[PDB]
Symmetry: D2
Subunit: 31 residues, 4 copies
């Protein structure tokens, strides 16, 4: 289940980008 | 310009979703 | 309800600081 | 100088809290 989040901001998208990569890292630490 | 973030997380996407809507409101206040 | 956080990051804290302010604005609009 | 955050939301602080803790982990990795 994917969700498309269209944004017209490089700064905003940058945040969600760093937050998304950081969340994925936590998963690797668990398993 | 214009960046689409395809997140497969209801929780994570929920955060960026609320952050995107809240960020758009600030832009309206400016000007 | 009021918790405190000890962050020594001007940029990081600045981000969460903007969210808190923008969050309070959403309550005024309600919707 | 340190910057305290006074949020009136357990959920909100959780986000900013998980971000600060998750962002600090990245430093340990470095590149």
């Amino acid at each position: 289940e994917s969700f498309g989040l269209g944004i017209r901001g490089r700064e905003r998208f940058e945040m969600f980008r760093e937050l998304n990569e950081a969340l994925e890292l936590k998963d690797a630490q668990a398993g």
